Amino acid sequence: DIVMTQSQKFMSTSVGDRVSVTCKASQNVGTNVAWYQQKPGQSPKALIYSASYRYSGVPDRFTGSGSGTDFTLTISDVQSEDLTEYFCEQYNSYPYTFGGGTKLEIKRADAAPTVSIFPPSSEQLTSGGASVVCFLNNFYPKDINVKWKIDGSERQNGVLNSWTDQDSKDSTYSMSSTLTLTKDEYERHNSYTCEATHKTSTSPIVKSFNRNE
Amino acid sequence: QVQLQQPGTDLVKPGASVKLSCKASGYTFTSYWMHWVKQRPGQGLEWIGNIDPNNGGTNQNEKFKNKATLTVDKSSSTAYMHLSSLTSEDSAVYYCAIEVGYYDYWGQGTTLTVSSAKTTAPSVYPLAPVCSSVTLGCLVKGYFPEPVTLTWNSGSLSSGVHTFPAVLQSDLYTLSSSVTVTSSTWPSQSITCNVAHPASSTKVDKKIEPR
Numbered sequence: 001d002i003v004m005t006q007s008q009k010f011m012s013t014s015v016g017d018r019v020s021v022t023c024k025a026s027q028n029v030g031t032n033v034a035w036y037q038q039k040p041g042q043s044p045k046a047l048i049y050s051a052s053y054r055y056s057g058v059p060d061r062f063t064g065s066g067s068g069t070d071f072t073l074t075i076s077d078v079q080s081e082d083l084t085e086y087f088c089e090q091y092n093s094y095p096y097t098f099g100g101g102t103k104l105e106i107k108r109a110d111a112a113p114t115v116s117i118f119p120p121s122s123e124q125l126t127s128g129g130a131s132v133v134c135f136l137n138n139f140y141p142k143d144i145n146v147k148w149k150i151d152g153s154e155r156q157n158g159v160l161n162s163w164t165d166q167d168s169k170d171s172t173y174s175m176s177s178t179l180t181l182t183k184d185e186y187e188r189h190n191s192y193t194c195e196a197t198h199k200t201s202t203s204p205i206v207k208s209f210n211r212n213e
Numbered sequence: 214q215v216q217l218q219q220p221g222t223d224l225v226k227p228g229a230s231v232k233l234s235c236k237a238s239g240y241t242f243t244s245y246w247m248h249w250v251k252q253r254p255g256q257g258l259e260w261i262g263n264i265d266p267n268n269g270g271t272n273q274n275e276k277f278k279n280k281a282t283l284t285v286d287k288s289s290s291t292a293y294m295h296l297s298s299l300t301s302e303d304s305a306v307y308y309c310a311i312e313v314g315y316y317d318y319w320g321q322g323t324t325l326t327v328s329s330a331k332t333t334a335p336s337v338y339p340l341a342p343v344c345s346s347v348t349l350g351c352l353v354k355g356y357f358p359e360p361v362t363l364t365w366n367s368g369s370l371s372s373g374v375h376t377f378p379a380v381l382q383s384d385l386y387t388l389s390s391s392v393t394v395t396s397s398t399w400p401s402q403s404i405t406c407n408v409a410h411p412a413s414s415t416k417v418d419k420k421i422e423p424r
């Protein structure tokens with residue numbers, strides 16, 4: 001089978017720049033190469049066919065070049081909306097084969113997280129669970145330290161964190177952090193704190209509540 | 214308008230067989246080759262094969278030779294992919310795709326989960342703030358299999374939304390979603406998370422109310 005190699009898993013760039021993603025075929029494929037864009041959780045969208053021809057409706061910021069074994073997708077005037085995965089594919093001979101994909105990544109200005117803490121809902125308490133949820137939204141860069149405290153004591157057991165991909169509107173990151181307790185554990189303490197350190201500040205962002213309010 | 218309709222969700226036991234369908238409309242079904250593509254959790258794309266609906270002729274990736282069979286039903290304009298002796302390695306999104314003129318068209322994909330764990334409906338909890346802009350939340354806890362669909366005000370509320378990837382905890386998934394609006398908007402106007410889990414025939418709306 002023909003092997004398509006996209007050697008870069010990740011490629012950093014800034015908005016307005018030009019960026020080039022490469023693909024090397026293991027044997028000659030003529031110009032019978034296609035490029036695709038994939039938004040997280042969506043079907044692929046074809047950008048280029050026959051190495052250099054845009055499918056209709058594709059912005060002309062996307063161009064393709066190459067023939068034989070070396071193929072390049074170039075994106076001019078990069079924007080937040082281009083934060084997707086890009087795949088090359090050869091359709092010169094069966095079986096058609098894809099490259100492993102390249103993720104774009106955008107350097108932008110630093111931004112502090114907006115932090116929100118949520119006590120268990122009354123409905124959840126009726127069923128015997130207690131989840132405390134903390135959102136840390138629209139920050140940059142990706143590095144962030146989240147810490148939970150209960151009654152002034154650090155809590156690590158039962159915390160689960162989930163990160164969005166870099167945002168296609170503003171190139172920021174967001175994160176959820178969920179502390180899952182039993183109802184008995186929740187009712188056995190009073191103060192619950194989600195706290196975050198991030199390079200935008202010299203002091204943690206602290207959001208807190210008391211169960212008995 | 215060219216459209217390819219795929220069922221969104223299929224959960225099956227290991228060792229079973231499944232028949233995935235792709236229903237076409239808006240063009241002459243027999244005039245265009247149908248392609249099938251596999252995409253595994255957090256992985257790349259694999260071409261499975263294509264089929265000529267006019268005569269049933271197929272080209273298949275040999276990787277899937279004893280796994281997949283492609284067929285078509287002319288009279289219902291439907292392409293099928295039969296997968297046999299399923300394993301967890303077959304859990305993936307499966308896409309059907311065509312090119313008509315100079316446009317590509319894709320089905321929305323069937324998320325096939327191969328597992329011996331059981332369909333579980335989620336509990337859906339509204340998250341209001343503690344007692345200039347306010348953030349609300351929606352917690353979707355304890356469901357199987359993926360996916361769930363979550364929207365805000367039936368999709369009309371789309372900006373300021375962050376819906377986070379699900380995480381797995383003891384064979385069940387949990388996700389949450391946040392939405393940020395101006396303090397003059399809520400609670401003066403109504404905001405509701407709509408959560409669908411097709412696998413469990415589950416559709417619920419939780420209005421966010423102040424505590």
Ligand SMILES: CCC(=O)N(c1ccccc1)C1CCN(CCc2ccccc2)CC1
Pocket residue numbers: 034046049050089091096248250260310311312313314315316317318
């Ligand atoms: C992964 C499936 C796949 O390989 N493709 C595909 C992509 C989207 C939807 C259906 C199939 C190829 C795309 C390029 N074409 C040849 C070029 C071309 C371009 C425009 C019109 C006609 C032909 C062969 C099939």
